[PDB]
Amino acid sequence: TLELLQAQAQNCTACRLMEGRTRVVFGEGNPDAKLMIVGEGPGEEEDKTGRPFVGKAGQLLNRILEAAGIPREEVYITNIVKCRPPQNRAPLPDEAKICTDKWLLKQIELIAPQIIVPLGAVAAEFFLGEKVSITKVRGKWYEWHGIKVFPMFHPAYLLRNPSRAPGSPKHLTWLDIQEVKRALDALPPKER
Ligand SMILES: O=c1cc[nH]c(=O)[nH]1
Ligand SMILES: O=c1cc[nH]c(=O)[nH]1
Ligand code: SF4
């Protein structure tokens, strides 16, 4: 079950990221979510609480979801890696592979989402099967194992580049989340 998997993950020592962590950040939300959001890795506040997207970038994500009319409790949120990399660096290829093989793939199998929104280039690369430019792939529909994939900018990028001008990261993200909401509402019932 997802709950057993979550419990087991708390004791994971599969990669070097276990060395500097405080708490494993497995993921949270609706276990039967139609929409799954996947970020890069935990930040400082996530590492302290064991919860994903609760720091500054997470608060922005909450604003984005609320504005789109998507209740956070109804979606499932996690990341490519479950442990905070040193000084918020991106996870290395071996860390991402080990963590996704051990946890993420099983989470996706159990939750069975119909739409996956990878936030940032690292998460986007995992689902698109190759290294990609987040600015070029964001806001477009792809597919991974029969699941719809819609890459979007990482909220941290929006905080680092907070311009309100037309075509800015924030503006494009608003357009993107509205598209996610539209697609979510048009989804057929899950195959059970
Ligand atoms: O949960 C989180 C928090 C910050 N950054 C991420 O990629 N994920
Ligand atoms: O980028 C965005 C989109 C929606 N709402 C926000 O606060 N920021
Ligand atoms: S990042 Fe993933 S694989 Fe590495 S120790 Fe944490 S839970 Fe295990």
Q: What is the CATH number of the domain that holds 107?
A: 3.40.470.10
The structure's method of determination equals: X-ray
Half-sphere exposure of 54 (CA within 13 A, CB side): 13
Confirm if 115 and 33 have CB atoms less than 8 A apart.
no
Q: Which two tokens stand for residue 35?
A: 């929409």
Resolution (angstroms) equals 1.5
Q: Please compute Rg for the chain using Cα positions.
A: 16
Is the four-CA dihedral 149, 140, 92, 156 of positive or negative sign?
negative
Determine the distance separating the centroid of ligand 2 and the alpha carbon of 63, expressed in angstroms.
Answer: 6
Nearest to 81 by CA among 136, 120, 138: 120
Nearest to 39 by CA among 61, 19, 21: 61
Query: Can you give the length of the chain in residues?
Result: 192
Q: Which two tokens stand for residue 190?
A: 């899950």
Q: How far is CA 180 from the centre of its chain?
A: 14
Tell me which of 21, 37, 40, 47 to substitute to probe ligand 1's pocket, judged by most ligand atoms within 8 Å of the beta carbon: 40
Task: Report how many domains make up the chain.
Answer: 1
Is the four-CA dihedral 93, 60, 190, 128 of positive or negative sign?
negative
Nearest to 91 by CA among 67, 121, 63: 121
Half-sphere exposure of 20 (CA within 13 A, CB side): 11
What residues make up the domain containing 139?
Answer: 1-192
- The residue whose C-alpha atom lies closest to atom 4 belonging to ligand 3 is 15
Per DSSP bridges, beta strands 76-79 and 35-39 are parallel
Cα gap 124→130, rounded to integer Å: 9
